[PDB]
Structure formats: C-alpha cells, structure tokens
Amino acid sequence: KGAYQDRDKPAQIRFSNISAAKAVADAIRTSLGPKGMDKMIQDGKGDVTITNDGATILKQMQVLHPAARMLVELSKAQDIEAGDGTTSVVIIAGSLLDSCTKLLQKGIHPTIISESFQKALEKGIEILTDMSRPVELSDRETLLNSATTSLNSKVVSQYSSLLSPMSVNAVMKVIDPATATSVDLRDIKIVKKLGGTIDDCELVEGLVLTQKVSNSGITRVEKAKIGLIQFCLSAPKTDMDNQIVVSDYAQMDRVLREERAYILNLVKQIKKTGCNVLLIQKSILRDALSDLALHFLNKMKIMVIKDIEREDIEFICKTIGTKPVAHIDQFTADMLGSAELAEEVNLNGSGKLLKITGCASPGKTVTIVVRGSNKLVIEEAERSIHDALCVIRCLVKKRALIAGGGAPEIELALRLTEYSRTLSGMESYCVRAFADAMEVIPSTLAENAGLNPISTVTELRNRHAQGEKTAGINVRKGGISNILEELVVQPLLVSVSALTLATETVRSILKIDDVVNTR
C-alpha cells in the first residue's frame, strides 16, 4: 500500500547528520547565558585560548562531520550578519534537527518537514516582529541596557560598568544618529598590549601607534603639526638602473657633498612648512630614513616616526586629518594635519605607545586600548567588546528591541503551538515539533543557572499563557520575573536573524540523502 523505499541509506545518512548536529549543539550548550562558562581550546600547536564566543569555539574546535562544518559556517554567518547570538543559533538548529528525527521516525517525507518548517519560520518572524517595540537612538538608557546584556554572558561582566558606556561611546562617536542605517566597524581600531588589568581599558578620540620614535630627544610635543610622508628621505635613486662613476679624487668629495646637500635641502623644505612631527611611511626597497636624514631632523628639533604600514594611511588621514605626500613640491602647510598634543606613553614598563590627542578636525574614528594580565583575558575582552559593538550595530541597523532571558523563544513556542493547533493535517506534527523544539533555549538558561529546568519552563509557559509577556528567567532573583524591569533587552535583528538562519540551514541539511568521499 505504497512505495517500498527499499534503499535505507538516505534515512541512515539523515539520522547520522541529525545526531552529529545534536552532538555539536549540546557540546557547547553549557556555554549559554550569564551562567554558562567558557571553554579552553588548545589546538595542535602550542596555542591556547579561553573563549566564550560560540563562533570562535566552533572555529577553533576543528570538527570532522559535514553537518558540524555546516553548523560552524552557520555560526560564522550569524556572526557576520548579527555578531551576537552565534551560540543560540547553533543550539536552535541542533535542537530542532533533534526534534525532526522523531518526525522522520513517524513516516513523514523530508520535503514536507522542510516546507512546514519554512511556514513555521514565516509565522515566527511575524510573532517576533509584533512582540517587539520601536526604539529611538540618542537614548542612552536603552543602548546601555543592550550593551550590558550583550556583555553579561562574557568574562568582562564584572567590568560592565566601565565597558558598556565606552562601548556605546565608540559607536556614537563614529556615526551621526540622524541618518546612518549602518555602521562601519573598521574605524573602531582595537589595540592590545600585555600588562595592567581589564579596569585600565581606555577610549581615545585621537590616534594610537605601536611604532617607536626614531629620535630619543623629544617625546612630548604640544600643538603638533603632523604630516604623512610617502617618499623616501635617503640618497636619490631613479627607478631605472642607477650608477655613479668616479674618475678623479675630487669626485669622491663632490659626490659626498651633493648627497649631503640634497638630504639637507629635503629636510629644510620639510621644516620650513612648520611641521612639528613627521610620520614616515614604511618603504621597502629604499630606506625611508637614513642616518644623515635622521641626524638633520633631530638637529631641527623635530619628532620622526617610521615604519608605518601602507594599510593604516587611510585610518591616519581620517583620524588626524593629514593628507598623503608623495612629492616634495606638494608638501605644504595647507595639507598638514594638526593636533593639540603628541605623546610617547610608557605603560608602567610593559611597552610603549604613541598617542595623538586633541586633533583640531575630529574625524569619525575612535580607538580602544585594552589592558590585561595574560594574553588570554585580553583576547577574550577584545571579543566581548567586539560583540557589544556588533549588538549596537544591529540596533542601529533596524530600530527594534525585544526582551531577553528566554522570553522571545518561549513566547514564540506558545504562539506557534496554538498556530499548529489550527493546521490539522500531516504538517501539524511538524509545526508542533518546531514549536516545542525552541523550548531548549529557556530550558538551558534555567539549567545553567542552577534552577530546576522542568518547573522553570512550565512556569514560563504558564505565565506567558496568562498574558504577562516579557517574562523570563532571572538569575539575580533566582527565579522567574519580568525582564524589562531587570534591564535585559536585545535587538530584534539578533533573534530574527538567528531564527531565519537556523531554519534555512536546517532546510538545507534536510535535503541531503547521500555522502561521497572525493579523492
């Protein structure tokens, strides 16, 4: 009474993929929420990291199963689009694949499951969008709450009083909240140096350099005139093959005199423009600084800095306002940046930094410097700050805000199960499985917090069934309560993108029915 489907290989492949996805999901399931702890990854080489970011955990943990690779790619894609929730997305994907293996055991074709999953996705997008509220920028309270919620599940939670305000200052000091619609994170330059503690992180509107000043006679310059240089301050040499022939004893003295005169002329041309500090670009094939040139510059009481990467010139120009100079005749004061102060700062014997502060033309660019005891905490602090910046980026992208702490997915689970109770047929079971497959996030939020998961989820469902929305798990109170009063929120883009990407990834995985090992 129907097709025999003799080949059981596709079913075995699907079960294997589902089991591998579930294994990857519940491997990192213990790293969710403000009570989930971070993992330590020691790769094949002598490198170790202490990470709570789901994307980095999945990248460093070199998986083997194809479904696990699909999940790590999904996590990195969610990081690209959102930047936060890269753990919840993989948890959701694994959980609902685990739910759909039972459906496969019930004799339901994979295409029907995929289409029903897509329909449940379409309903859930509407549920989440209606659940949210509009948000207006330039409101410090909501931005701070979102940044703190992003930072809470990270190692820098205890520093949230010092990192959240600077995390929102960094974003607000780059874009104009009037018409932005996006933010470019490239101009938030993160510089890391060993030493100090996390509490000494700083935000500077100026520029930070890791290079060292060539002349150790001046380090502090007040009312500095900065100027980039893209040509070489050495003996002249043409692009074509160059040779100097000497046939007299006076030729040697003459050639030395001409070299010295040319260098001194270049340095005098630089100095007569009022330049106070010099930024020399890193030039391979020609020493950008010579001993004679540096000697003359130091004699004229100037500060010289070399070995500046070609990729940083745009950042420097956007920050302090200089314009690149590739010819001496074009070097004038009309294209010479200015700053209130240039300093060479010592970090209590743990390195040296260059700080340019008080640029008279403050560009749309700030810099963050981080301090820490060991390398691992510094890297984790960088990742946490980046996640907070990405959260603010999502909030800027589309202006919508939802409650956190398990409220969105549990409310969606309800609304979707009563949606399934109106679609009687073969797809009713699949939609109900989708609805009950996202109870995993609140369950794990309750579990990692030490609460009883079953009772907590039951109370959550009951309280959202009574219309008391924005209710979720509180770890400070140690129970269940309203979340907005607890100041825990997240942008709608995070959750909506997580759900959409997870559903798309699962719908793609469910279409696999064979695996072949290529040569």
């Binding site: 489907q5 699909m70 790619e73 074709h109 120009c317 279409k511 064979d514």
Partner: protein
C-alpha cells in the same frame, strides 16, 4: 590472455571477453545509480567531502560537479564523466539526465546481450531509434519569438523548470524572474561573463537580488571623493606605477649625485605629465587595471577625481559594458576616446564590506547579482543553480525553439521509437524496444524520487501518448497526469536534443568494446 605465457608487464593486464563488458557495464550502472537520486523537482542533493588537502566540502545537486569531483577508476565511468562535462559545457544543464539515460541504455544493453544478440545489432537498432526520436522531438518542438509576451512567459517557464530541481526552488517565485532579467540585460550577447555573482554570508536566501546597476569590490584612493553624481568614467589599462621606458639596456651613468636627483625629478615630471594628459579628457572617475602608486594617487586626489585601482580584465570589461566607456592605454587624443557615464558611484555597505555602486548606468549590458545565504555550502549551491538557469536562458534566447518538459517530450519520442519498432523485423526490433524502455525510464525515476506509483503513472502516460494526446506529463504538486500546456512546464529544445544525442552516441561507443587493456601504473 590466459595463455601459459604472459607478455604484458608486471602490472599490465587484459580483459578480452565478457569480463571487459561486465566491468564496463557495472561501472556505468554504478555511475548511473549514483546520479539517479538527483532527478526531478523532488530530487535530494548530496555531500562531497574530501580526503586530503583542506578537506573541501560542497553540497551539490547537479551531476556534472558530482562526476567531476569524485575519482572514477573504471574506464566506462571515465567516459560517462567526460560525457557529463561536455554536456555541461555545451548547454548548461541536462548532465544528470544524460548520465542517467546513458546508464539506463547500457543496462538495457546488458539485458539484451544476456539474450545472445550481437552488439552491432543493438548499435544499429539504436541508431535507427535515435533518428526516429530526433525526428519526433523536432516535429513536436513548438516555437515562439515572433510574439513578445509569449516569449517572455516562455522564458519565465524555462527558468522555473530549470531552477525547480535545485535548492533555489524554495524561493522559486522570487528567483526565476531574477535569472530571466539577467539574461534580458545582455541584449542577445552570449557573454555570461557579463553576469557577476557576488556571494556574501548572512541573511536568508530570499534577500538575494539583481542590482539596478553594477557592484565593484575594490577600494577608493585616500584623498579621493567617495561619491560622484553624473560622472564621466574613463576606463584605462595603463601602468602608471613606475612606467619603465620599456627599452631594455637603458641606465643612468652620471658623475654626480645632483644628476641623479634631476633624473628622478624628470621621472616624476613625466608621471605628472601623463596624469595631466589623462585629466585633459574632462573626467571625474578613472578606472585602471593594475595598481596606482602613491604619486598618481596624490595627483588624482588633488585634481578631485576618483581612481579605482587593480581591477582585473573581467572588471574593466564589465565596467565598459555597463557604463559605455572605452578601454584606453594612451591619451594623446582625448577626442577619440569615448567616456562612459553613470549617475551615482557612491559606496554601499553589504554584509560587513563596502562596495562601489555604479547606479543609473548608461547601458544595462552587464549586471551583478548578490547572493546572501546562511552557509558557504548554501552559497555555492545557489551560485551553481543560478549559473545553470542563466546558461539555459541564454541558450533559449539564442534558439527560441522549446519542447514540453515534465517527461512529455521524452515520452513522445519513446512512443515514436515504439511505433518504429512495431514495423521492423528481425532482432533490431527488440533493440529498439529496449531503447524506448530506457528512454521511458527517466520519468519513472522522476516519480520514484517524488515517491509516487511510478508504474501506474508511466502506464497512464504511455496510454495518453498512444491515444494521441502529445501534451501530457506528470503533475508533481499532486502527483497525477496533467496537460503541460496549462502547467507550462517548458524546456529548451536544444537541451533535450543534446541530452538525447550525447547519451546515444556515448552509449554506442561504450557498447562496442570487447577488450580492456590496462598498462602498469606510474
């Protein structure tokens, strides 16, 4: 050769009997069974996982890349793989169908040889049968093109039916027209390189779109403006980095340093003179092919004109097509070089990257498609499916003749082969009947993948085509027999003809080998 003397080598062997055709048939049938589970709109795609360098992983449904990536060892499997690659190169799709049909033909051939019938008889019968099938398909090949709306509806139907067997079917109603629009921007020029598919992670697959202009993944200079209105874009293929005189053996030989300083000043002077000659064109956007060093960058920034550096040959050709410019290398005559024009060249942020957006382009000859999925495998599969759709649409734009899909065309040529077989004597008739059965196996496989009663549906279609209804096929949305004219499951005539002919000829060449001789490996 089993003789008590061995002559070949330590490693070389010969199979000069039913062993050789046994190996060839089992290899071909193995390839066909590998491809079989990826047919029809209900087919399911496969995972290709490496066993070595970088462990490349790709999710794919089309059989061309499946047969290309895996390493076959049976020479018959090599013939099938080369068949699939050639068929993919020729038109763009039908690789799965041609491999499946050739495998089914070889299975029928082995069944025939089991009845002790000489292979040349099978070859002659198949030659006659494929002639009859060619004639039937050509006779049933409806044609459009004189009308405008009918041809565009045909294009939409062809895109939908070619994209329906891939992942993109999940958003079929959104994607097919997209593909159609792309080809409709080429104005009949069969240059698929004018289509650029930029893939970036993030966002659902429904967020893909065809831009109303061009997207370039390059960088602006330092001091250049980041936004230009009503540009006059000049596209060039000059060096303008160091500009070697290109006269090898030239060197400076001077007795003082001031001479070298003067020579280098003269070099920078000739750079400035060349940049001034370029600026004499009256332009505000300059596009190069190779790098622009710091001095020309500064000259451009002082002038106030944009400069796009290091755009490969494809980039400059696509910008010339989409904007109307002319690839230049010398600028002695500004009145002979034609300059392209756009409306806005602002920067647009997609994903986490910034791209140059030529909007309001003068000509739509070239365009770009942005693919934004959830996984790198999803991106690769989407790109491959879109490439297949574009190839088929360009082919049917070149040749507007179309035949009905869903199994109707292959059913009708199978019926023609059956009618031919019913009037021929001798052992060739059974060969023709086997050919017809192998040709009819394709809709059987489609229904099997779908999960319907394949035998009942195939018998229904056989009766429908024997009675006289030549526009009947499979309705997948419910799994019944329907009228393809109403459903509009069209297909390119050239694609079907290529599948039929290539499968027939490769089956013929494989069928007539009675000795496999392997030299010792390297």
């Amino acid at each position: 050769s089993l003789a008590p003397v061995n002559i070949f080598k330590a490693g070389a062997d010969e199979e000069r009997a039913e062993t050789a055709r046994l190996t060839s048939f089992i290899g071909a049938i193995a390839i066909g069974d590998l491809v079989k589970s990826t047919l029809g709109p209900k087919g399911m795609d496969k995972i290709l996982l490496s066993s070595g360098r970088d462990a490349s992983l790709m999710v794919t449904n089309d059989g061309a890349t499946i047969l290309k990536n895996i390493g076959v060892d049976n020479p018959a499997a090599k013939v099938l793989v080369d068949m699939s690659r050639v068929q993919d190169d020729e038109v763009g799709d039908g690789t799965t169908s041609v491999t499946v049909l050739a495998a089914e033909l070889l299975r029928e051939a082995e069944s025939l040889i089991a009845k002790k019938i000489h292979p040349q008889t099978i070859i002659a019968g198949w030659r006659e049968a494929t002639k009859a099938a060619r004639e039937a398909l050509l006779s049933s090949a409806v044609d459009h093109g004189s009308d405008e709306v009918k041809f565009r509806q045909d294009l939409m139907n062809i895109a939908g039916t070619t994209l329906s067997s891939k992942l993109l079917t999940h958003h079929k109603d959104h994607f097919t027209k997209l593909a159609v629009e792309a080809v409709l921007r080429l104005k009949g020029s069969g240059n698929l390189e004018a289509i650029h598919i930029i893939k970036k992670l993030g966002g659902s697959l429904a967020d893909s779109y065809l831009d109303e202009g061009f997207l370039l993944d390059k960088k602006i200079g330092v001091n250049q403006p980041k936004r230009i209105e009503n540009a006059k874009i000049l596209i060039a293929n000059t060096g303008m980095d160091t500009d070697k005189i290109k006269i090898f053996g030239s060197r400076v030989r001077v007795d003082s340093t001031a001479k070298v300083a003067e020579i280098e000043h003269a070099e920078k002077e000739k750079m400035k003179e060349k940049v001034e000659r370029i600026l004499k064109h009256g332009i505000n956007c300059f596009i190069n092919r190779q790098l622009i060093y710091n001095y020309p960058e500064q000259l451009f920034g002082a002038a106030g004109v944009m400069a796009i550096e290091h755009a490969d040959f494809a980039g400059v050709e696509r910008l010339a097509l989409v904007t109307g410019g002319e690839i230049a290398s010398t600028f002695d005559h500004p009145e002979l070089v034609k300059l392209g024009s756009c409306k806005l060249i602002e920067e647009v942020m997609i994903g986490e990257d910034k791209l140059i957006h030529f909007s309001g382009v003068a000509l739509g000859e070239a365009c770009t498609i942005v693919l934004r999925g959830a996984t790198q495998q999803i991106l690769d599969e989407a790109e491959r499916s879109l490439h297949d759709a574009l190839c088929v649409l360009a082919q049917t734009v070149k040749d507007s003749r179309t035949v009905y899909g869903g199994g109707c065309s292959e059913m009708l040529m199978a019926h023609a082969v059956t009618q031919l077989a019913n009037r021929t004597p001798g052992k060739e008739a059974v060969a023709m009947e086997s050919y017809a059965k192998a040709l009819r196996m394709l809709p059987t496989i489609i229904a099997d993948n779908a999960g319907y009663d394949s035998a009942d549906l195939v018998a229904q279609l056989r009766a429908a085509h024997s009675e006289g209804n030549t526009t009947a096929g499979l309705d997948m949305r419910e799994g019944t027999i329907g009228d393809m004219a109403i459903l509009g499951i069209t297909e390119s005539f050239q694609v079907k003809r290529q599948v039929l002919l290539s499968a027939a000829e490769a089956a013929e060449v494989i069928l007539r080998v009675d000795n496999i001789i392997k030299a010792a490996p390297r």
